[PDB]
Structures are given as structure tokens and as C-alpha cells.
């Protein structure tokens, strides 16, 4: 999914679980005037089923999906990194913004300009590439109107249905998370005297940014390259742009 | 609000206001029965539109005056409620006529005619006139007993419609593309079942299906006919006979009362 579009998918869909998770989660204690023993039982089963939802998502990852590129050396015509062939130089392709483009053989080609496309006519609602030289025979039926034969910009996906299972499982995990927050924060008030509740928020809030958010990116960053091993070693230099975010290792 | 409305009243229920309005309504209905020959309606078309605008103005008079007189008590009585609905139709078709071009393409437009029949509804007011002069109440007794019978008539009628509706749903589900001319649409399924319920040419649809589609419709249609014509309509007959029997016993005891 397009990185700009992919960012939207989480941004526009994690909130609807989150907002009611506090709203339904908070109102459970508020309406029932839940006790300290009651909330602890409330938090446990809240999280336990959530983890099995995360576990359910993990089971979903097992199912196979269409694969584009990363097909080891380009059909025997060049190796990973051949990518810098003649058609790279003429249309001035740059190894940082490369995107995958689909050929009519269902084979996924990266860097639409590297596809050898010496001409590109762009319509109002789509981007398309013409005279695509560095393409292989491909091109079984293809199509077009004002022009004949050409390859269409972006990735081609035929089996993205699993997506509705993924969010659906993602929503209910998110809701359970936001109704775990209220029980923990609600209890903190009870076991502290009224004059000392002012310093109560500061104690937990100090752990929020330092103990958690300072070591976290480094823990991600080390394991981010663990699945992004295949960095663009030819141009980018010191790990600026990867090409193989390991679709099996990152999931695990 | 107490003297103006009250004099509007005492002029409204007046024994001349009623006669004036009944004269108007009997004239409107004699025109409306004139207009159903095509030898007079086509000739006297130019005078009829004049007369009908006149009647629209008269009905404006009466309806507004009655509303101002009797508040929501006017809306209370259903005889008037009929008149108010007729009024609404009249004013709506008036404004629609003015917002269109009175030509052939509007004569043959279905909505023009549909708005015109509701004008026919004015003739219903004529019964009110016939009531004061008297119908002789010769059918007062039959009407009274029909009045007694209706509460259960409605119930059995809606039960048999429900049976109609379920069978129509299932027949649409099953027998498409086996004579689509009959029930290719849900509405024409429902009409086909309703017209079966009168038993006119009902074998024809069985034969028509058997010709090109298939005959599974025969047990469905036989069971349908059993339920509806054989056990439901006979219920209507039975309940009507029992109701008139009660009417007769009431009459016998009443005449022995004297």
C-alpha cells in the first residue's frame, strides 16, 4: 500500500477503536462505581482476549499474498542492482524514489522509468508509461485507446481482500487497549491522599517519555534493519533507503 | 376572537349556508357526470374550466371559513377531513396547471389525469346531500350490519393478504425465467397471485409454465388455492352470515319488546 496511503490507513482507522475504548471503557467504572478489586479483574480479561486478537492477526499473516520483485536476479537478465542498466541513465532514474510498476505479465517491476519507458502520457485519473523498453516480452493482451500497449504506474494487487480481516482484527485490539488505560489511571487516584494527587500524575508521566520513549526507537531501529537488511548499498550510503522489508521476519 | 369567531360560527352552521353549499355540490356533481360522455365534455370544455375555477374559489371560501370558525374541531370530523383532502388536491392541480403549458403532451401525461380523478372525489360530498333529503335508509340496516361485521373482516382480510404476500415472495424467488412475462418483477408476482385469488384463467399460468419452464408450480398453486379460496373467503361468508343472524335476533327481541 502506498506509503502516503498506508499512513492514512492507520491514522484514519485506529481512532474509531480508540475513542469509544475510553468512552465505553471509562463509563464501565463510572456507571458501576467499580472498586479496586473490580477493576483489576476488569483489566485482566480486557487484555487477555486482546492478545489473542493480536495472536489472531499473527495467524492471518500466515496466509500467502501476491509477490512483486525480489524474484532474485531479474529473470536471469541482471542481478539485484542491475537496476542501473542503460534505461536507468537515459530517463535519469534515481534510486531513492523508485516505485514498483506492473507489467502485463503480472510481474512487478520497480522504478517505472527503469522499465525502459521512453515515453509517458499522463491522463486525468491515472499515470501510465509508454515505449517501456527494459520490459521483458510480457504484454499478453495489455490494452489502451488513444495509444496502444503500455504499462501502468504503481503496484498491481489481485488479492488484497485479507485487508478487511486485518483491520477488523486491528479495531477490536485497539478498543481493548483504550479500555485498559482507564482502569490503570483510575486506580492511581484512589491510593494517594487528596493533597498528594497533584504530584501523582507527574510520577507516572516521568516514566512516559524517558523510560519508554527514549529507548524505544533504538529498539525499533535495530530490529527495523533486521527486516530491512537489503539496503540500497549502491547509492544511499549509510542505510537511507531499503528495498526488502522482510515480509516474513518483520511479521514474526 | 370571541365575537368574530362566534358570528362566523352562527353564520356557518346556519340553515342556509348548508343549503347553499349543497346546491353548489349538486351542481358540481351534475357537471362531473356530464363530463363522462366525450360528446359533451369535448364541446363544453371551455365553460367547464370556467365553472371549475369558480368552484375552486367557492371551496376556498368554505374551507377557510370553517377552519377559522371551528379550530381543530374542523380537523376532528372525518366528513370534513375528506373535504380538506379534496381541497388540497384541487389547489395542487391548479398550481401545477399554471406551472405547465396546457397542451396535448400534458393532456396525455398520466399525472394530469391522476390529479383529475381526485376531482371526481368531490362527488362523494353528494352523499351528504342525499343523507339530508334521505336515502330512505332503505340500506340503513344492511349498512349497520356491515358496520358490525367490519372489525373481523379487516382481520381476516389482512391475514389472507399476508398469505398472499409470503407466497408471492417465494414464487418470485423460485420461478423467475420460467415465464418472466408473468412475474419477472416482485410487483407483478404479487398481482399475479392476487388475480389468482379470484380464479380467472388460473390454469393458464400452470399450462404456460409447463410449456417452457417446469411444472413444479402445480403443488404450490393447488395449496395456494386451497388455503385462500377454499378456507379464507368462506370465512368471510361465515362471519357475515353470523353477523346478520345476530342482527335478526336483535330485531326479533326488539319487535317482541313492544
Amino acid at each position: 500500500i502506498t506509503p502516503g496511503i498506508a499512513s492514512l490507513l492507520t491514522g484514519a482507522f485506529v481512532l474509531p477503536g480508540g475513542i469509544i475504548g475510553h468512552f465505553l471503557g471509562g463509563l464501565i467504572v463510572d456507571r458501576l462505581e467499580m472498586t479496586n478489586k473490580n477493576k483489576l479483574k476488569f483489566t485482566l480479561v480486557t487484555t487477555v482476549v486482546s492478545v489473542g486478537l493480536f495472536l489472531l492477526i499473527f495467524f492471518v499473516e500466515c496466509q500467502t499474498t501476491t509477490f512483486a520483485g525480489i524474484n532474485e536476479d531479474y529473470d536471469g537478465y541482471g542481478q539485484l542492482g542491475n537496476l542501473t542498466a542503460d534505461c536507468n541513465e537515459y530517463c535519469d532514474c534515481t534510486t531513492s524514489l523508485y516505485t514498483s510498476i506492473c507489467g502485463r505479465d503480472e510481474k512487478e517491476y520497480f522504478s517505472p522509468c527503469f522499465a525502459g519507458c521512453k515515453a509517458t502520457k499522463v491522463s486525468q485519473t491515472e499515470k501510465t508509461y509508454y515505449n517501456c523498453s527494459c520490459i521483458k516480452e510480457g504484454l499478453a493482451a495489455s490494452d489502451d485507446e488513444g495509444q496502444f500497449i503500455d504499462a501502468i504506474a504503481g503496484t498491481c494487487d489481485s488479492d488484497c481482500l485479507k485487508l478487511p480481516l486485518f483491520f477488523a482484527f486491528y479495531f477490536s485490539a485497539t478498543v481493548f487497549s483504550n479500555m485498559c488505560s482507564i482502569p490503570v489511571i483510575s486506580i492511581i487516584l484512589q491510593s494517594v491522599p487528596a493533597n498528594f494527587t497533584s504530584l501523582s500524575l507527574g510520577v507516572t508521566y516521568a516514566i512516559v517519555k524517558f523510560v519508554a520513549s527514549v529507548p524505544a526507537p533504538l529498539l525499533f531501529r535495530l530490529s527495523s534493519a533486521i527486516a530491512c537488511i537489503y539496503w540500497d548499498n549502491n547509492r544511499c550510503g549509510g542505510k537511507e533507503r531499503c528495498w526488502i522489508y522482510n515480509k516474513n521476519i518483520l511479521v514474526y | 376572537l370571541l365575537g368574530l369567531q362566534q358570528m362566523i360560527l352562527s353564520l356557518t352552521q346556519s340553515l342556509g349556508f348548508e343549503t347553499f353549499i349543497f346546491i353548489v355540490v349538486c351542481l358540481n356533481t351534475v357537471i362531473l357526470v356530464a363530463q363522462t360522455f366525450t360528446e359533451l365534455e369535448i364541446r363544453g370544455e371551455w365553460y367547464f374550466m370556467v365553472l371549475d375555477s369558480i368552484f375552486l374559489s367557492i371551496y376556498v371560501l368554505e374551507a377557510v371559513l370553517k377552519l377559522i370558525a371551528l379550530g381543530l374541531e374542523y380537523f376532528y370530523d372525518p366528513w370534513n377531513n375528506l373535504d380538506f383532502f379534496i381541497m388540497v388536491m384541487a389547489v395542487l392541480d391548479f398550481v401545477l396547471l399554471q406551472i405547465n403549458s396546457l397542451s396535448y403532451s400534458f393532456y396525455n401525461h398520466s399525472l394530469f389525469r391522476i390529479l383529475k380523478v381526485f376531482k371526481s372525489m368531490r362527488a362523494l360530498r353528494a352523499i351528504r346531500v342525499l343523507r339530508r333529503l334521505s336515502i330512505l335508509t332503505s340500506l340503513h340496516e344492511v349498512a349497520g350490519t356491515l358496520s358490525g361485521s367490519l372489525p373481523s373482516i379487516t382481520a381476516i382480510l389482512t391475514l389472507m393478504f399476508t398469505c398472499l404476500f409470503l407466497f408471492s415472495v417465494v414464487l418470485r424467488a423460485l420461478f423467475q425465467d420460467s415465464d418472466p412475462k408473468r412475474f419477472q418483477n416482485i410487483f407483478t408476482t404479487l398481482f399475479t397471485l392476487f388475480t389468482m385469488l379470484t380464479l380467472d384463467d388460473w390454469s393458464l399460468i400452470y399450462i404456460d409454465n409447463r410449456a417452457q419452464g417446469a411444472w413444479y408450480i402445480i403443488p404450490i398453486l393447488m395449496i395456494y388455492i386451497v388455503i385462500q379460496y377454499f378456507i379464507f373467503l368462506n370465512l368471510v361468508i361465515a362471519v357475515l352470515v353470523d353477523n346478520f343472524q345476530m342482527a335478526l335476533l336483535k330485531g326479533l327481541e326488539k319487535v317482541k319488546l313492544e
Binding site: - | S152, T162, L174, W202, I237
Partner: protein, 281 residues
């Protein structure tokens, strides 16, 4: 508090209002389903899944409620006629989900009628109507009265069908290039459905003339058969049913009137019995 849970939840009135809402809705969503598999649009794609998920929502909700009645008693669950029939119906409505997830037999004529059974549920919805109960109980009780009359009718269908096979044999074994109703007396089943059609007084004269159009089949036996079936079967017997049902309504009136009389007489004895203790005091 385990069975008590199901007992309690199955008792909430807003909960029951909701479930009857579900019955009304599945009835009216199966309607628009069969209408809207039309490829004359693409904006209809967005409502196809909405209606389908509503379908399976109401379906699985029926299963969860049935399991709720299991958890409640599990013992009288097989004694209430309505509840056990609903179990039957939901079972035979979830059978289509299996037959489609298997897809073994075919996508054929039996399959479609197994699906539509769902709407049947709404019958219970009308048990809540006040008079409908009266008309129906009286309707079932009267039907009980005329039990043997239907056995006479069955005998007479036997009679007329198996003699109409023999009366009209040269007619069904005919070669006249132009005929319409050459089938009605072909076999026994066709003969029985024909006897029903004649029982309903539809196209009797047309069929009779068709029979006459064969130079064989003397017009004095076909005529006698048809006319005697129409008189006896179609006018008398159809009228005896109406007579019987009017009689049963008269009966119901008689028992209601006598019980009103008994209650009034008991009340008169009370107004006579109440003065006794007043005087005895």
C-alpha cells in the same frame, strides 16, 4: 447463576422488542435481496454486501438465541411447539450455508427453496395480534369439525380422476394436428390435477369442447362426466364447507352466550348471597 442468566436475558422486554425487530428486518431484507441481483448498475455493489451481512447477522443471532434457550432449560426445549419449530426452521435455514460451503450436489432447483425458508419466522410475530388468535383458534377448531367431509372429497377425487383416465383415452391418444388440452388426461397425476381444475370451475367448457373436437369420445359420456362432476363436486361440495363453517361460528356463539349467562346467574346468586350475611349480622 448459569441457567438463571439465560432465563433473565430472555425475559427483558427491550430485548424481545429488539428480536422481533430482527424478525421484521430479515423478512424485509430477503425481499430486496432477490430483487437486486441486477447487473444494470455498479452503485448496487455497495448495498449487496450490506444486505448480505445483515442476512448473516440475523442468522447467527437466531443461532445465539436458540443456544440461549438451550442454556435456559434444555429440557422443556423439546415440548413447546413454537420453540421446537423455530429450531427446525433455523436448522433447515443453516443447512444452505453448509450446502454452499460444500457445493457438492449442484446449484439447482432444490437449493433456492431451501434458502427462502427464513421469512417463515415472522409467523410468530402475528401471534401477538389480539383477534388473529381468535380467528385462528376458531379456524383450527372448525377445521377439526369437518374432518370426514374431506375424506369424502378425497374419495371423489379418486373416483373422478381414475374414471377420467378411462373415459378420455382416445382423446389423449389422438393425432389431430390442432388441439389444446391434449395432456389433461394423459396419466393419473394429470388426471388428478385436471379434476382439481374442474373443481375450481376454470375452463370447463373449453376443455369439454376440446374433447368434442375428436371424432371419437361420444358426446354423451364426456358431457355426463363433466356435468356431473361440476354439479356434485363443484357446487354442492363447495357449499357444504361454507355451511359447516357457519355452523361452527354459530356453535362458538352459543357457548360464549351460555357462559355469559352462567356468570350473570352466579352474580345474581351473589347479590342474593350477600344479603344473607348482612341479615345474619
Amino acid at each position: 447463576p448459569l441457567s438463571l442468566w439465560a432465563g433473565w436475558v430472555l425475559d427483558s422486554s427491550v430485548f424481545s422488542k429488539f428480536i422481533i425487530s430482527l424478525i421484521f428486518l430479515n423478512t424485509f431484507v430477503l425481499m430486496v435481496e432477490i430483487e437486486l441481483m441486477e447487473s444494470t448498475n455498479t452503485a448496487l455493489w455497495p448495498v449487496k454486501l450490506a444486505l448480505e451481512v445483515a442476512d448473516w447477522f440475523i442468522l447467527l443471532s437466531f443461532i445465539v438465541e436458540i443456544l440461549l434457550m438451550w442454556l435456559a432449560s434444555f429440557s422443556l426445549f423439546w415440548k413447546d411447539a413454537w420453540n421446537v419449530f423455530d429450531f427446525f426452521v433455523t436448522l433447515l435455514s443453516l443447512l444452505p450455508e453448509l450446502v454452499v460451503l460444500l457445493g457438492v450436489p449442484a446449484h439447482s432447483v432444490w437449493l433456492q427453496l431451501l434458502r427462502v425458508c427464513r421469512v417463515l419466522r415472522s409467523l410468530k410475530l402475528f401471534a401477538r395480534f389480539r383477534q388473529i388468535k381468535v380467528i385462528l383458534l376458531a379456524l383450527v377448531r372448525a377445521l377439526k369439525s369437518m374432518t370426514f367431509l374431506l375424506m369424502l372429497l378425497l374419495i371423489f377425487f379418486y373416483i373422478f380422476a381414475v374414471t377420467g383416465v378411462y373415459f378420455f383415452r382416445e382423446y389423449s391418444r389422438s393425432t389431430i394436428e390442432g388441439l389444446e388440452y391434449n395432456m389433461f388426461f394423459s396419466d393419473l397425476l394429470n388426471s388428478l390435477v385436471t379434476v382439481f381444475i374442474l373443481f375450481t370451475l376454470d375452463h370447463w367448457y373449453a376443455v369439454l369442447q376440446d374433447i368434442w373436437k375428436v371424432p371419437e369420445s361420444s358426446r354423451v359420456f364426456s358431457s355426463i362426466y363433466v356435468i356431473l362432476w361440476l354439479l356434485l363436486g363443484s357446487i354442492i361440495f363447495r357449499n357444504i364447507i361454507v355451511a359447516m363453517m357457519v355452523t361452527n361460528f354459530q356453535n362458538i356463539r352459543s357457548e360464549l352466550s351460555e357462559e355469559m349467562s352462567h356468570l350473570e346467574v352466579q352474580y345474581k346468586a351473589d347479590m342474593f348471597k350477600q344479603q344473607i350475611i348482612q341479615r345474619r349480622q
